[PDB]
Scaffold this active site. Structure first.
Site, PDB file in Angstrom:
ATOM      1  CG  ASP A   1      47.046  35.156  30.469  1.00 11.16           C
ATOM      2  OD1 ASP A   1      45.935  34.573  29.878  1.00 11.16           O
ATOM      3  OD2 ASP A   1      46.448  36.522  30.713  1.00 11.16           O
TER       4      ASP A   1
ATOM      5  CG  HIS B   1      39.014  38.587  32.519  1.00  2.00           C
ATOM      6  ND1 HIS B   1      39.435  39.874  31.320  1.00  2.00           N
ATOM      7  CD2 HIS B   1      39.555  38.107  33.163  1.00  2.00           C
ATOM      8  CE1 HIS B   1      40.761  40.352  31.822  1.00  2.00           C
ATOM      9  NE2 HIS B   1      40.973  39.008  33.283  1.00  2.00           N
TER      10      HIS B   1
ATOM     11  CE1 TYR C   1      43.938  42.048  31.827  1.00  2.00           C
ATOM     12  CE2 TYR C   1      45.721  40.568  30.626  1.00  2.00           C
ATOM     13  CZ  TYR C   1      44.248  40.620  31.500  1.00  2.00           C
ATOM     14  OH  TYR C   1      44.784  39.360  32.089  1.00  2.00           O
TER      15      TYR C   1
ATOM     16  CE  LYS D   1      43.114  36.331  30.933  1.00  2.00           C
ATOM     17  NZ  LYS D   1      43.757  37.319  30.809  1.00  2.00           N
TER      18      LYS D   1
HETATM   19  N1  LIG Z   1      42.250  36.504  34.885  1.00  2.00           N
HETATM   20  C1  LIG Z   1      42.220  37.120  35.063  1.00  2.00           C
HETATM   21  O1  LIG Z   1      41.443  38.279  36.841  1.00  2.00           O
HETATM   22  C2  LIG Z   1      43.513  38.204  35.643  1.00  2.00           C
HETATM   23  C3  LIG Z   1      43.648  39.300  37.216  1.00  2.00           C
HETATM   24  C4  LIG Z   1      45.223  39.688  36.930  1.00  2.00           C
HETATM   25  C5  LIG Z   1      46.647  39.231  36.090  1.00  2.00           C
HETATM   26  N2  LIG Z   1      45.886  37.918  35.345  1.00  2.00           N
HETATM   27  C6  LIG Z   1      47.121  37.343  34.312  1.00  2.00           C
HETATM   28  O2  LIG Z   1      48.116  37.117  35.157  1.00  2.00           O
HETATM   29  C7  LIG Z   1      49.824  37.599  35.023  1.00  2.00           C
HETATM   30  C8  LIG Z   1      50.382  38.884  35.993  1.00  2.00           C
HETATM   31  O3  LIG Z   1      49.924  38.717  36.857  1.00  2.00           O
HETATM   32  P1  LIG Z   1      49.982  40.293  37.212  1.00  2.00           P
HETATM   33  O4  LIG Z   1      50.160  41.268  35.968  1.00  2.00           O
HETATM   34  O5  LIG Z   1      49.210  40.933  37.943  1.00  2.00           O
HETATM   35  O6  LIG Z   1      51.924  40.798  38.406  1.00  2.00           O
HETATM   36  P2  LIG Z   1      53.079  39.821  38.756  1.00  2.00           P
HETATM   37  O7  LIG Z   1      53.300  38.466  37.484  1.00  2.00           O
HETATM   38  O8  LIG Z   1      53.081  38.778  40.242  1.00  2.00           O
HETATM   39  O9  LIG Z   1      54.075  41.024  38.537  1.00  2.00           O
HETATM   40  C9  LIG Z   1      53.850  41.631  37.868  1.00  2.00           C
HETATM   41  C10 LIG Z   1      55.239  42.845  37.959  1.00  2.00           C
HETATM   42  O10 LIG Z   1      56.479  42.102  38.590  1.00  2.00           O
HETATM   43  C11 LIG Z   1      57.719  42.637  38.260  1.00  2.00           C
HETATM   44  N3  LIG Z   1      58.492  40.810  37.623  1.00  2.00           N
HETATM   45  C12 LIG Z   1      58.697  40.206  36.236  1.00  2.00           C
HETATM   46  N4  LIG Z   1      59.612  39.916  36.886  1.00  2.00           N
HETATM   47  C13 LIG Z   1      60.171  39.712  38.058  1.00  2.00           C
HETATM   48  C14 LIG Z   1      61.266  39.957  38.497  1.00  2.00           C
HETATM   49  N5  LIG Z   1      62.269  38.538  37.630  1.00  2.00           N
HETATM   50  N6  LIG Z   1      62.073  40.426  39.466  1.00  2.00           N
HETATM   51  C15 LIG Z   1      61.287  41.510  40.219  1.00  2.00           C
HETATM   52  N7  LIG Z   1      60.131  41.597  39.449  1.00  2.00           N
HETATM   53  C16 LIG Z   1      59.148  41.307  38.138  1.00  2.00           C
HETATM   54  C17 LIG Z   1      57.188  43.721  36.893  1.00  2.00           C
HETATM   55  O11 LIG Z   1      58.344  44.253  36.234  1.00  2.00           O
HETATM   56  P3  LIG Z   1      58.400  44.564  34.563  1.00  2.00           P
HETATM   57  O12 LIG Z   1      57.521  44.233  33.850  1.00  2.00           O
HETATM   58  O13 LIG Z   1      58.191  46.037  35.118  1.00  2.00           O
HETATM   59  O14 LIG Z   1      59.793  44.129  34.792  1.00  2.00           O
HETATM   60  C18 LIG Z   1      55.647  43.737  37.268  1.00  2.00           C
HETATM   61  O15 LIG Z   1      55.851  45.345  37.907  1.00  2.00           O
HETATM   62  C19 LIG Z   1      48.574  39.384  34.194  1.00  2.00           C
HETATM   63  O16 LIG Z   1      49.661  40.283  33.331  1.00  2.00           O
HETATM   64  C20 LIG Z   1      47.442  39.270  33.443  1.00  2.00           C
HETATM   65  O17 LIG Z   1      48.653  38.093  31.821  1.00  2.00           O
HETATM   66  C21 LIG Z   1      44.538  37.569  35.279  1.00  2.00           C
HETATM   67  O1  LIG Z   2      40.951  42.016  35.071  1.00  2.00           O
HETATM   68  C1  LIG Z   2      42.758  41.686  35.463  1.00  2.00           C
HETATM   69  O2  LIG Z   2      42.831  40.523  34.581  1.00  2.00           O
HETATM   70  C2  LIG Z   2      43.205  42.530  36.090  1.00  2.00           C
HETATM   71  C3  LIG Z   2      42.342  43.253  36.257  1.00  2.00           C
HETATM   72  N1  LIG Z   2      41.610  43.645  37.481  1.00  2.00           N
HETATM   73  N2  LIG Z   2      41.211  44.683  38.233  1.00  2.00           N
HETATM   74  C4  LIG Z   2      40.632  44.112  40.104  1.00  2.00           C
HETATM   75  C5  LIG Z   2      39.235  43.702  39.418  1.00  2.00           C
HETATM   76  N3  LIG Z   2      38.468  43.070  40.387  1.00  2.00           N
HETATM   77  C6  LIG Z   2      37.187  42.483  39.405  1.00  2.00           C
HETATM   78  C7  LIG Z   2      36.859  42.430  40.554  1.00  2.00           C
HETATM   79  C8  LIG Z   2      35.070  41.382  39.699  1.00  2.00           C
HETATM   80  C9  LIG Z   2      34.176  40.814  40.025  1.00  2.00           C
HETATM   81  F1  LIG Z   2      34.259  39.941  39.791  1.00  2.00           F
HETATM   82  F2  LIG Z   2      34.264  40.475  41.449  1.00  2.00           F
HETATM   83  F3  LIG Z   2      33.011  41.684  40.706  1.00  2.00           F
HETATM   84  C10 LIG Z   2      34.927  42.158  38.208  1.00  2.00           C
HETATM   85  C11 LIG Z   2      35.696  42.608  37.672  1.00  2.00           C
HETATM   86  C12 LIG Z   2      37.238  42.585  38.691  1.00  2.00           C
HETATM   87  S1  LIG Z   2      37.907  43.578  37.428  1.00  2.00           S
HETATM   88  C13 LIG Z   2      40.390  45.371  37.328  1.00  2.00           C
HETATM   89  O3  LIG Z   2      40.248  47.054  37.457  1.00  2.00           O
HETATM   90  C14 LIG Z   2      41.408  46.016  36.154  1.00  2.00           C
HETATM   91  C15 LIG Z   2      41.401  47.218  35.328  1.00  2.00           C
HETATM   92  C16 LIG Z   2      42.001  46.884  33.590  1.00  2.00           C
HETATM   93  C17 LIG Z   2      42.488  45.293  33.375  1.00  2.00           C
HETATM   94  C18 LIG Z   2      42.472  44.990  33.639  1.00  2.00           C
HETATM   95  C19 LIG Z   2      42.060  44.947  34.716  1.00  2.00           C
END
Ligand SMILES: NC(=O)c1ccc[n+]([C@@H]2O[C@H](COP(=O)([O-])OP(=O)(O)OC[C@H]3O[C@@H](n4cnc5c(N)ncnc54)[C@H](OP(=O)(O)O)[C@@H]3O)[C@@H](O)[C@H]2O)c1
Ligand SMILES: O=C(O)Cc1nn(Cc2nc3cc(C(F)(F)F)ccc3s2)c(=O)c2ccccc12
Length: 315
Positions: A43, A110, A48, A77
Site C-alpha cells: 500500500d 485518497h 507518503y 492513491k
Molecule cells: N487511506 C488512508 O487515509 C490511510 C491512512 C492511514 C494509513 N493508511 C495505510 O495503512 C498503513 C498502516 O497504518 P499506519 O501506518 O497508520 O499504522 P499501523 O500499521 O497501525 O502501525 C504502524 C506502527 O506499528 C508498529 N508495528 C508494526 N508491526 C508491529 C509489531 N508486530 N509489534 C509492535 N509494533 C509494530 C510500527 O513500527 P515500526 O515500523 O517501527 O516497526 C509503526 O510504528 C499505512 O502505513 C498506510 O499504508 C492509509
Molecule cells: O492520508 C493518509 O494516508 C495518512 C495521513 N493522515 N493524515 C491525517 C489526515 N486526516 C485527513 C482528513 C481529511 C478529510 F477528508 F477529512 F478532510 C483529508 C485528509 C486528511 S489527512 C495526515 O495529516 C497525513 C499527512 C501526511 C501524510 C499522510 C497523512
C-alpha cells in the site's frame, strides 16, 4: 484463501505492507524483506513521499525474479490537491514512474475532499483552515474511470468515504465502474460495523488501515488509548500463543477485510505475515468488537470545515 475477489474480476491479497511514515532510507529494504517473506501487496501513496524508494525495492525483486509482476498487487492513491480532471492522469503517471510500474493494481481516491492545487499537500489559509478545491467526488470518479480505460490501473476505489459518499458514487449518473475497494480506518477501537456491512453488501471490498492503532502517528498523545498495550487484547493473544500485533492483524482478516499493517522493522514485517496459521474464535471476534470507542487516528482538525469532510456523520 489468501486473496479476496474484487468486483473487477481480479484477486487481492488480504495482507499488505503499509508504507505511511516508513523513512525513505529504510523502506527499500523494508519492501525487499516483505516480498522475501511472502508479502505480495504494497500500500502506497504519493503523499507518503517515499514511492521512489518503494519502487526501487519492487523493481529489484522483479529483476531478481523473486516474483512476477502479475503476482504483485500494488496500490496507490490520488492525493487531495489533484482532484481536478486535468490533474488526475499526470498524478497517476508520477506515481507509476516513481514505483517503476506500467500499471497499478488499484488506485484510490485518497480522501473525498479536494484541496487547492499547488505544490502544497495541505494548502492552508492564514487561519489554518485547509483551502478547498471546487471539485466534487463524482467528476473525480469519472477521471478515475478514464485511467482504467487507458490501461494505467486495473481497479479503482475510494478511501475514507462515508456511507453517504459511497452511496453517491454508486448512484452516480452514468456510473461506468463501481469502486472495488473502500479503504478505511478500522481496528478494535473503531470497528465500523455499519460502514463495512454497507460496503460488503454492495460488493465493495473494505481494506482496514492503521490496524495496530498507528503508534508512530506524529500527533500521538499520552492519554490516547493504546491497542498494542491493551491488557484485554494481550490476554487474547496470550491464549493463542501469538503476539498482540498478530491478533490485531488477524482480527480484520476474519471480517473478510484486507489489512495493511506498516513496519520497517524486519522482524516485525516477518511476524506480521505469520497470521495464516491460526484462528480467533467467534467469541474472540465479538469480544474484540466490543472494545469499540469510535477513536480515530486519522481525522485532521484543519480539514473539518471542508464540505465533504467524511466524519461528522455516524458512519
Ligand atoms: N487511506 C488512508 O487515509 C490511510 C491512512 C492511514 C494509513 N493508511 C495505510 O495503512 C498503513 C498502516 O497504518 P499506519 O501506518 O497508520 O499504522 P499501523 O500499521 O497501525 O502501525 C504502524 C506502527 O506499528 C508498529 N508495528 C508494526 N508491526 C508491529 C509489531 N508486530 N509489534 C509492535 N509494533 C509494530 C510500527 O513500527 P515500526 O515500523 O517501527 O516497526 C509503526 O510504528 C499505512 O502505513 C498506510 O499504508 C492509509
Ligand atoms: O492520508 C493518509 O494516508 C495518512 C495521513 N493522515 N493524515 C491525517 C489526515 N486526516 C485527513 C482528513 C481529511 C478529510 F477528508 F477529512 F478532510 C483529508 C485528509 C486528511 S489527512 C495526515 O495529516 C497525513 C499527512 C501526511 C501524510 C499522510 C497523512
Amino acid at each position: 484463501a489468501s486473496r479476496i475477489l474484487l468486483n473487477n474480476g481480479a484477486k487481492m491479497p488480504i495482507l499488505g505492507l503499509g508504507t505511511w511514515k516508513s523513512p525513505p532510507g529504510q523502506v527499500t529494504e523494508a519492501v525487499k524483506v516483505a516480498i522475501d517473506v511472502g508479502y505480495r501487496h504494497i500500500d502506497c501513496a504519493h503523499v507518503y513521499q517515499n514511492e521512489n524508494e518503494v519502487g526501487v525495492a519492487i523493481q529489484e525483486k522483479l529483476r531478481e525474479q523473486v516474483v512476477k509482476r502479475e503476482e504483485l498487487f500494488i496500490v496507490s492513491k490520488l492525493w487531495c490537491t489533484y482532484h481536478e480532471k486535468g490533474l488526475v492522469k499526470g498524478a497517476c503517471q508520477k506515481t507509476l514512474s516513481d514505483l517503476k510500474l506500467d500499471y497499478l493494481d488499484l488506485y484510490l481516491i485518497h480522501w473525498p475532499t479536494g484541496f487547492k492545487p499547488g505544490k502544497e499537500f495541505f494548502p492552508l489559509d492564514e487561519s489554518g483552515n485547509v483551502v478547498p478545491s471546487d471539485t466534487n467526488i463524482l467528476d473525480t470518479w469519472a477521471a478515475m474511470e478514464e485511467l482504467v480505460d487507458e490501461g494505467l490501473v486495473k481497479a479503482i476505489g475510494i478511501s475514507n468515504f462515508n456511507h453517504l459518499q459511497v452511496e453517491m458514487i454508486l448512484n452516480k449518473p452514468g456510473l461506468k465502474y463501481k469502486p472495488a475497494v473502500n479503504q478505511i480506518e478500522c481496528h478494535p477501537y473503531l470497528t465500523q460495523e455499519k460502514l463495512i456491512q454497507y460496503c460488503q453488501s454492495k460488493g465493495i471490498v473494505v481494506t482496514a488501515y492503521s490496524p495496530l492503532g498507528s503508534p508512530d502517528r506524529p500527533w500521538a498523545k499520552p492519554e490516547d488509548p493504546s491497542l498494542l498495550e491493551d491488557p484485554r487484547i494481550k490476554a487474547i493473544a496470550a491464549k493463542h500463543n501469538k503476539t498482540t500485533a498478530q491478533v490485531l492483524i488477524r482480527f480484520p482478516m476474519q471480517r473478510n477485510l484486507v489489512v495493511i499493517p506498516k513496519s520497517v522493522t524486519p522482524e516485525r514485517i516477518a511476524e506480521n505475515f505469520k497470521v495464516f496459521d491460526f484462528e480467533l474464535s467467534s467469541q474472540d471476534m465479538t469480544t474484540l468488537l466490543s472494545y469499540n470507542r469510535n477513536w480515530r487516528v486519522c481525522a485532521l482538525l484543519s480539514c473539518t470545515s471542508h464540505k465533504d469532510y467524511p466524519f461528522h456523520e455516524e458512519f
